[PDB]
Design an enzyme around this catalytic site. Structure first.
Site, PDB file in Angstrom:
ATOM      1  N   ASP B  25      29.805  34.236  54.694  1.00 50.72           N
ATOM      2  CA  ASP B  25      29.585  35.028  53.366  1.00 50.72           C
ATOM      3  C   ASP B  25      28.113  34.631  53.783  1.00 50.72           C
ATOM      4  O   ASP B  25      27.556  34.469  53.194  1.00 50.72           O
ATOM      5  CB  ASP B  25      30.218  34.947  52.419  1.00 50.72           C
ATOM      6  CG  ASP B  25      30.034  35.493  51.241  1.00 50.72           C
ATOM      7  OD1 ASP B  25      29.531  36.729  52.138  1.00 50.72           O
ATOM      8  OD2 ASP B  25      30.339  36.018  50.180  1.00 50.72           O
ATOM      9  N   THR B  26      27.425  36.229  54.365  1.00 48.49           N
ATOM     10  CA  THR B  26      26.032  36.121  54.304  1.00 48.49           C
ATOM     11  C   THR B  26      25.703  36.491  53.053  1.00 48.49           C
ATOM     12  O   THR B  26      24.137  36.724  52.796  1.00 48.49           O
ATOM     13  CB  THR B  26      25.595  37.251  55.472  1.00 48.49           C
ATOM     14  OG1 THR B  26      25.942  38.307  55.347  1.00 48.49           O
ATOM     15  CG2 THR B  26      25.892  37.014  56.271  1.00 48.49           C
ATOM     16  N   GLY B  27      26.750  37.365  52.385  1.00 48.97           N
ATOM     17  CA  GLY B  27      25.671  37.579  50.649  1.00 48.97           C
ATOM     18  C   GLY B  27      25.753  36.609  50.000  1.00 48.97           C
ATOM     19  O   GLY B  27      25.594  36.756  48.868  1.00 48.97           O
TER      20      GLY B  27
HETATM   21  C1  LIG Z   1      30.376  43.388  47.126  1.00 48.63           C
HETATM   22  C2  LIG Z   1      31.275  43.391  46.919  1.00 48.63           C
HETATM   23  C3  LIG Z   1      32.556  44.214  48.035  1.00 48.63           C
HETATM   24  C4  LIG Z   1      32.799  42.510  47.628  1.00 48.63           C
HETATM   25  N1  LIG Z   1      34.635  42.184  47.440  1.00 48.63           N
HETATM   26  C5  LIG Z   1      35.126  41.942  48.431  1.00 48.63           C
HETATM   27  O1  LIG Z   1      34.742  42.674  49.383  1.00 48.63           O
HETATM   28  C6  LIG Z   1      37.259  42.090  47.605  1.00 48.63           C
HETATM   29  C7  LIG Z   1      37.232  41.207  48.422  1.00 48.63           C
HETATM   30  N2  LIG Z   1      37.403  43.357  47.961  1.00 48.63           N
HETATM   31  C8  LIG Z   1      36.912  44.007  47.509  1.00 48.63           C
HETATM   32  O2  LIG Z   1      36.933  44.230  45.730  1.00 48.63           O
HETATM   33  O3  LIG Z   1      38.015  45.493  47.727  1.00 48.63           O
HETATM   34  C9  LIG Z   1      39.586  46.020  46.707  1.00 48.63           C
HETATM   35  C10 LIG Z   1      40.476  45.746  45.952  1.00 48.63           C
HETATM   36  C11 LIG Z   1      40.665  45.824  44.467  1.00 48.63           C
HETATM   37  C12 LIG Z   1      41.582  45.198  44.095  1.00 48.63           C
HETATM   38  C13 LIG Z   1      42.242  44.212  44.679  1.00 48.63           C
HETATM   39  C14 LIG Z   1      41.613  43.867  46.067  1.00 48.63           C
HETATM   40  C15 LIG Z   1      40.641  44.613  46.816  1.00 48.63           C
HETATM   41  C16 LIG Z   1      32.457  40.639  47.206  1.00 48.63           C
HETATM   42  O4  LIG Z   1      32.375  40.174  46.103  1.00 48.63           O
HETATM   43  N3  LIG Z   1      31.651  39.255  47.771  1.00 48.63           N
HETATM   44  C17 LIG Z   1      31.247  38.424  47.874  1.00 48.63           C
HETATM   45  C18 LIG Z   1      32.340  37.897  49.371  1.00 48.63           C
HETATM   46  C19 LIG Z   1      33.118  37.335  47.717  1.00 48.63           C
HETATM   47  C20 LIG Z   1      34.907  38.094  47.926  1.00 48.63           C
HETATM   48  C21 LIG Z   1      36.145  37.767  47.151  1.00 48.63           C
HETATM   49  C22 LIG Z   1      35.749  37.009  46.249  1.00 48.63           C
HETATM   50  C23 LIG Z   1      34.689  36.543  45.632  1.00 48.63           C
HETATM   51  C24 LIG Z   1      33.548  36.559  45.956  1.00 48.63           C
HETATM   52  C25 LIG Z   1      29.884  38.209  48.492  1.00 48.63           C
HETATM   53  O5  LIG Z   1      29.925  38.021  49.458  1.00 48.63           O
HETATM   54  C26 LIG Z   1      28.463  39.543  47.743  1.00 48.63           C
HETATM   55  O6  LIG Z   1      27.611  39.063  48.889  1.00 48.63           O
HETATM   56  C27 LIG Z   1      28.505  38.686  46.724  1.00 48.63           C
HETATM   57  C28 LIG Z   1      27.339  40.238  46.199  1.00 48.63           C
HETATM   58  C29 LIG Z   1      26.906  39.249  44.808  1.00 48.63           C
HETATM   59  C30 LIG Z   1      26.078  38.656  44.325  1.00 48.63           C
HETATM   60  C31 LIG Z   1      25.221  38.984  43.311  1.00 48.63           C
HETATM   61  C32 LIG Z   1      25.977  40.014  42.429  1.00 48.63           C
HETATM   62  C33 LIG Z   1      26.920  40.937  42.206  1.00 48.63           C
HETATM   63  C34 LIG Z   1      27.581  40.951  43.256  1.00 48.63           C
HETATM   64  N4  LIG Z   1      28.007  37.361  45.944  1.00 48.63           N
HETATM   65  C35 LIG Z   1      28.412  36.561  45.340  1.00 48.63           C
HETATM   66  O7  LIG Z   1      29.067  37.762  44.559  1.00 48.63           O
HETATM   67  C36 LIG Z   1      28.011  35.376  45.301  1.00 48.63           C
HETATM   68  N5  LIG Z   1      26.311  35.435  44.656  1.00 48.63           N
HETATM   69  C37 LIG Z   1      25.366  34.987  45.513  1.00 48.63           C
HETATM   70  O8  LIG Z   1      25.296  34.321  46.349  1.00 48.63           O
HETATM   71  C38 LIG Z   1      24.202  35.105  44.363  1.00 48.63           C
HETATM   72  C39 LIG Z   1      23.446  36.239  44.798  1.00 48.63           C
HETATM   73  N6  LIG Z   1      23.512  33.777  44.122  1.00 48.63           N
HETATM   74  C40 LIG Z   1      24.257  33.673  42.730  1.00 48.63           C
HETATM   75  O9  LIG Z   1      24.471  33.749  41.434  1.00 48.63           O
HETATM   76  O10 LIG Z   1      22.876  32.182  42.346  1.00 48.63           O
HETATM   77  C41 LIG Z   1      23.401  31.520  41.496  1.00 48.63           C
HETATM   78  C42 LIG Z   1      21.985  31.544  39.840  1.00 48.63           C
HETATM   79  C43 LIG Z   1      22.253  31.770  38.443  1.00 48.63           C
HETATM   80  C44 LIG Z   1      21.950  32.591  37.877  1.00 48.63           C
HETATM   81  C45 LIG Z   1      20.378  32.991  38.485  1.00 48.63           C
HETATM   82  C46 LIG Z   1      20.635  32.952  39.917  1.00 48.63           C
HETATM   83  C47 LIG Z   1      20.733  32.856  40.513  1.00 48.63           C
HETATM   84  C48 LIG Z   1      28.780  34.271  44.997  1.00 48.63           C
HETATM   85  C49 LIG Z   1      29.201  34.046  46.341  1.00 48.63           C
HETATM   86  C50 LIG Z   1      27.956  32.810  45.481  1.00 48.63           C
END
Ligand SMILES: CC(C)[C@H](NC(=O)[C@H](C)NC(=O)OCc1ccccc1)C(=O)N[C@@H](Cc1ccccc1)[C@@H](O)[C@H](O)[C@H](Cc1ccccc1)NC(=O)[C@@H](NC(=O)[C@H](C)NC(=O)OCc1ccccc1)C(C)C
Lengths: 99, 99
Positions: B25-27
């Site tokens: 996960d590059t994100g």
């Molecule tokens: C962006 C979405 C389309 C993506 N989800 C999907 O593609 C999903 C699986 N598909 C999908 O939703 O399809 C429709 C659907 C609907 C109903 C039922 C089934 C399907 C997603 O969330 N992808 C994430 C991976 C993932 C997949 C499934 C389940 C859980 C995680 C990360 O790659 C994606 O990059 C997100 C993007 C994001 C980040 C921040 C805010 C909003 C969005 N990052 C994350 O969630 C990551 N966060 C980060 O890396 C953040 C940037 N850093 C962070 O939070 O650091 C701690 C911090 C705390 C406080 C202050 C500062 C930092 C997480 C895995 C650690």
């Protein structure tokens, strides 16, 4: 280009006439943009991530220039805090992971 | 390997003796695992994603074999629905994005 991952893989995109920065996100099925005026019709959609689900507006056949690579496809617009380029678009630009 | 993105870039990982599937996960800044017994001390942490935050346990110096590539680093353990390999580990295995 070959992007290493020492930092967030942010790229410049052009979508609907606007210049945005967006994250190349292999963990995103879908492409999700904030703070863009996208013209025309759409359909209601939910995407899930860490900590829960957001409502998004689904726009089909949206034109995107991601780092000089044109793609056309589904772009979700909703309250994501980071512009996400998901696999639907990453495949269209020939993007791969390598190690 | 060169992973295209037509499907989720899920890889097999070994962590704490257990075999898991996880998403390259590059994100993701961070690597987040569900349903793993991780031994020893940790510190409380919050990660944000789409739709909100989750509390995680932060484990330092955790050994990970991601697709035959050993990495050691911070692994968060918390209620993510997908095991995430984030950039802290993707850098260690030499993983890049390419298009
Ligand atoms: C962006 C979405 C389309 C993506 N989800 C999907 O593609 C999903 C699986 N598909 C999908 O939703 O399809 C429709 C659907 C609907 C109903 C039922 C089934 C399907 C997603 O969330 N992808 C994430 C991976 C993932 C997949 C499934 C389940 C859980 C995680 C990360 O790659 C994606 O990059 C997100 C993007 C994001 C980040 C921040 C805010 C909003 C969005 N990052 C994350 O969630 C990551 N966060 C980060 O890396 C953040 C940037 N850093 C962070 O939070 O650091 C701690 C911090 C705390 C406080 C202050 C500062 C930092 C997480 C895995 C650690």
């Amino acid at each position: 280009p070959q992007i290493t991952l020492w930092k967030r893989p942010l790229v410049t995109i052009k979508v609907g006439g606007q210049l945005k920065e967006a994250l190349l996100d292999t963990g995103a099925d879908d492409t999700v943009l904030e703070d863009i005026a996208l013209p025309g019709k759409w359909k209601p959609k939910m995407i899930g991530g860490i900590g829960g689900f957001i409502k998004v507006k689904q726009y089909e056949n949206v034109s995107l220039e991601i780092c000089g690579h044109k793609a056309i496809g589904t772009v979700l617009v909703g309250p994501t805090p980071v512009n996400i380029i998901g696999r639907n678009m990453l495949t269209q630009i020939g993007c791969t992971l390598n190690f």
